[model samples]
Target: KGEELFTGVVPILVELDGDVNGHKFSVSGEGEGDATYGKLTLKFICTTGKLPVPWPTLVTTLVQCFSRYPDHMKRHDFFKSAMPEGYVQERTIFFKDDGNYKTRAEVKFEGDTLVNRIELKGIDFKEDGNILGHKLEYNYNDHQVYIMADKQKNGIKANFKIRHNIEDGGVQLADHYQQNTPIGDGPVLLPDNHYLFTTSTLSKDPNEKRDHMVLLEFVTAAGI
Candidate 1:
């Protein structure tokens, strides 16, 4: 896939600003220049309904990017905070005869802090002809969440604690010579029901040239 990375939330909004499959598509407030939450763009590709872009394609795209540039993007100091209260959801697009999967998370405020619980339930690729389960949990006052599962079989074991930092203003900082970096910082220039956040991969090796980071602008459902 031809993937290009940029800072802030511009790439996300830019990708959703046009028509898909001849259907009228636009963000919550396309030209208003405001902050939005819980808003999503759906695209139909030989499916019964429109498929959300960020949740399905964008989410997976980031994951794939991490896999490809682990040493570069995985070592940044983002992903060390907590996600704001909101409802996030995404599903994979099915090809001609391939199995698809869906992932969703519900973040809520309990007392003074936030809690997030995510679940991924669906068909995944097979490795050694076996499949595994996926899980995640984040408690209030915790800086990180536990994630474990298999995209293939038991061969790929990713049991690690993932952290996140919510960047509302829009500025993203990273090491020098990084490929993807934030473009600006402000009150979040998107529509409503959407928020900006950043996360970096955790690296144990000290001199591993850690500079991997990503900023995401996602939508939250009502009552988040």
Candidate 2:
């Protein structure tokens, strides 16, 4: 486990966790910067009732994230510090086999619950790496929809999700019917006039179709 590549240690921010009626929810998030920004992220987990497998629900909530660094430098007194960089972190994902864990996740779920206990991995970066640049993409959801990266940037990965009424303090949720996936990632309006992309699930159960996959976008203040 002494493999290099993953050395960035991100501080964790647990913004949400508790029970709603009979449903369970919790958000293990994060923020940015050593002096400025702090925001949200996954670590978000949710489930329902006594039935664990089909969890049918995931996460949607608070976080600590930042984009631009605020000016605290009094011209000279603060000039000693460098400009704040974009936020970037490494995350590795592991899939399960017939009891062995490996790359390319392929786990089973009961209803929607993962029965295999897929392994979690972390990504690695260098000291000279750009805080905002990434070559990876991921997703986040709200019981209904899950938004993901449409493309890669710089040399790092930047994925996204979650929306606001921006009105007050609350979250949103969207759900999909069997076989019918969710929205966004409306890439190439292929051929004659239709967008083309692959929509699939690892669930062995045909009845285990999609549920959380919605429409929403999160762009850093600096467009990272």
Candidate 3:
């Protein structure tokens, strides 16, 4: 029981930068930069109480907050060999959903050297969905994630990315996503409890302006 477990933390802010229901609502929340972002937080807060974006319609994706990362520099690496060996027995983690259901791990050590890897997974849109519309259900298992920040209790600032497996057959789904091949599809480094995700990974909103990614408290229950 000496292992620490982090769980259930979510973002409290987001950006739509769109006018919804005549509110001219832009970024919504009480977190940092909401006002400096030129957003109307008071209006949103007065109406919604909490500081999360209020999606009037049903959103299939797990979005706790929306951000375009107002001032964060994009990251290049999602996997870092920072955690101690065998720090987790089995784990469930995510940027917005389950870690176990989303991914699995193959933790190996080459004679005291760690050689770990995370496998990304995906599923296609059921009825010939396109990549730009409601039909394009790029339902991502979004399996690869890591705590890149070494600070304690900051509890924010980690990295996550999408990857593949052989028979990673879906050409539409075959993006390694960490490199600049797609430009903005690399590991999204949360700049705090706030996060920014690519719109490509979210459930498409014909009028959406951003993807609502999230950071959460997680416990890497050690088994050793």
Candidate 4:
């Protein structure tokens, strides 16, 4: 049987939050270079277990690619050159639904530092909407990034702290538990936010015969 399994670059929206200097800020905009006042939405995806390159380097490459081609040609070339092997290709158009004013920004790596220059256009503050100019910079050594919007133009500003750690899947598990409804007697309550955890597994092999075994462990303080 022949089945076509699709595997490629998948567009993913990432939410980033940090500080502008001492002010807190966040972005939830989608697909590279879009951010809200409180949150920024970054468009990125990864198939490999780790990042293909450093964040600054990737930003620089994208900036250069966009500068060379402002249209579809730029995107095609950028994907061919910059995207890693087995990575998903991005085809999501920016600002398709909301015909509001669009913003574009450039990110580049300067030695050990990263710089981002942002511009807002096509909207007037008095008539249609307001425009904000923002500048973002990050230092790899310090593991921190700073964002400054043109205060004179009523732009937003903030700084961000960065940290890398293992994915604990805590959020996903929490969501699952929240959606799960217990039936009948329900779960046994424990003292001080403790729970009895148990898992059963049966082995099936042609040469080996075993019924099943249950492992019991006490989890404290919401340990998963």
- Top model number, lDDT: 3
The residue-by-residue lDDT of candidate 4 on 15-117, one tens digit each, is 3232222223333222322111111123332222232122321221122111122222221222113222211111111211111222344333233222333
C-alpha-based local distance difference test score of model 1: 0.22
Lowest-sum lDDT 10-residue window in model 1: 172-181
lDDT of 3: 0.24
Query: Candidate 3, residue 195: CA error in Å?
Result: 17
Computed on alpha carbons, the lDDT of every model, listed in order, comes to 0.22, 0.22, 0.24, 0.21
TM-score for candidate 3? 0.22
User: Which of candidates 1 and 2 is the stronger one according to lDDT?
Assistant: 1
lDDT of the structure predicted as candidate 2: 0.22
Clashing pairs in 3: 6-217, 6-218, 7-217, 14-66, 93-99
Off by over 4 Å in 3: 1-11, 16-129, 146-171, 174-224
Off by over 4 Å in 1: 1-85, 93-99, 129-199, 204-224
Residue 121 C-alpha lDDT in model 3: 28
lDDT (0-100) at residue 222 of candidate 3?
A: 10
Predicted candidate 3 versus true structure: per-residue lDDT over 94-162, tens digit per residue: 212211112223332334233223332222222222221222223433332332333332213333444
